[PDB]
Design a protein around this nucleic acid. Structure first.
Ligand SMILES: [Mn+2]
Ligand SMILES: [Mn+2]
Ligand code: NA
Ligand code: NA
Length: 327
DNA sequence: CATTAGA
DNA sequence: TCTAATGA
């Protein structure tokens, strides 16, 4: 956590680089189990060899470790860090919709800068166009103060359309968060569950309304169950307009709402921990259900959930408020 | 790990 | 159809 820190750190620098600038999934995969491993190690690693003893760590990485130990640096990281090509690939990648592969390609063509990307808006798909469009607005955190107004709105229109819709703004906002990166609304309806062969309109009506009133101003992708876009708060009485924000809305078979909600509410760790616990408790938990366990090794048979509680109750735990699902 | 865009 | 990019 702090003992092997630089180690795992330089290791991640490395991995990350293989995978993005290079297309070496393998080495990239190497650097990672290793970092995964040197991370678990309970002692200060003093040299390659000591590390080396570890599974995943070979001679190549061990060699990195010595130089890194002997000098608080590494040439390859120093070389990479300098590499404009590589820098470039790193940066483009930030644009929403630009992945490594495309990052690679643009570079090839010679588009390294934001402005490059601009003179070439033609070569970008819609997603990336939008990503290019709100580049600044997307990199900003979402002050809670705003999350509240946004949530306020989404809720209202939702209710305005069907009275029967249930919405929940999940995420860190759900958990207290002073700010968030985007907004995740999970939604469901009574007339939509595991069986009852869809009703795409469910998602659609809603998107439509939010759009109607000008909440959503752009579409990243809209399927029949996962809508992904951009919203904005009505930029009041001038002088101050609101930054463009990412928003995701996803339909959920009401019969799996709570699990889902439970899940996306997080945090990553409270989750795992809870998950690890349901296990002992003779259970199973994933983003949609909770199945009681069985001795033959495994079992199925989805228990009925009516609220975050049922789940809690199942694994016989203390209801933990969102605020405290921190870990 | 599953969902959408695109080509 | 597959391959990319988001997500969480
Ligand atoms: Mn989120
Ligand atoms: Mn999101
Ligand atoms: Na080894
Ligand atoms: Na990106």
């Amino acid at each position: 956590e702090t003992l092997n820190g630089g180690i795992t750190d330089m290791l991640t620098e490395l991995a990350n680089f293989e995978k993005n600038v290079s297309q070496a999934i393998h080495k990239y995969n190497a650097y990672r189990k290793a970092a995964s491993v040197i991370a678990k190690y309970p002692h200060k690693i003093k040299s390659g060899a000591e590390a080396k003893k570890l599974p995943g760590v070979g001679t190549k990485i061990a060699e990195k470790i010595d130089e890194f130990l002997a000098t608080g640096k590494l040439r390859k990281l120093e070389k990479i860090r300098q590499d404009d090509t590589s820098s470039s690939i790193n940066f483009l990648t930030r644009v929403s919709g630009i992945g490594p592969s495309a990052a690679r390609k643009f570079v090839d063509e010679g588009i390294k800068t934001l402005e490059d990307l601009r003179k070439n808006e033609d070569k970008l798909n819609h997603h990336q166009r939008i990503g290019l469009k709100y580049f600044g607005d997307f990199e900003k955190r979402i002050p809670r103060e705003e999350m509240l107004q946004m949530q306020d709105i989404v809720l209202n229109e939702v209710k305005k359309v069907d009275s029967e819709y249930i919405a929940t703004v999940c995420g860190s906002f759900r958990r207290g968060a002073e700010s968030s990166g985007d907004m995740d609304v999970l939604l469901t309806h009574p007339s939509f569950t595991s069986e009852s062969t869809k009703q795409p309109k469910l998602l659609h009506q809603v998107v439509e309304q939010l759009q109607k009133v000008h909440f959503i101003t752009d579409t990243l992708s809209k399927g029949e169950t996962k809508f992904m876009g951009v919203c904005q708060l009505p930029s009041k009485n001038d002088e101050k307009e609101y930054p463009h924000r990412r928003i995701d809305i996803r339909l959920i078979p009401k019969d799996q709402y709570y699990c889902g909600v439970l899940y996306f509410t997080g945090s990553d760790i409270f989750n795992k921990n809870m998950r690890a616990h349901a296990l002992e408790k003779g259970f199973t938990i994933n983003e949609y259900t909770i199945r009681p366990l069985g001795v033959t090794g495994v079992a199925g048979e989805p228990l009925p959930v009516d609220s975050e509680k049922d789940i809690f109750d199942y694994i016989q735990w203390k209801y933990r408020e969102p605020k405290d699902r921190s870990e």
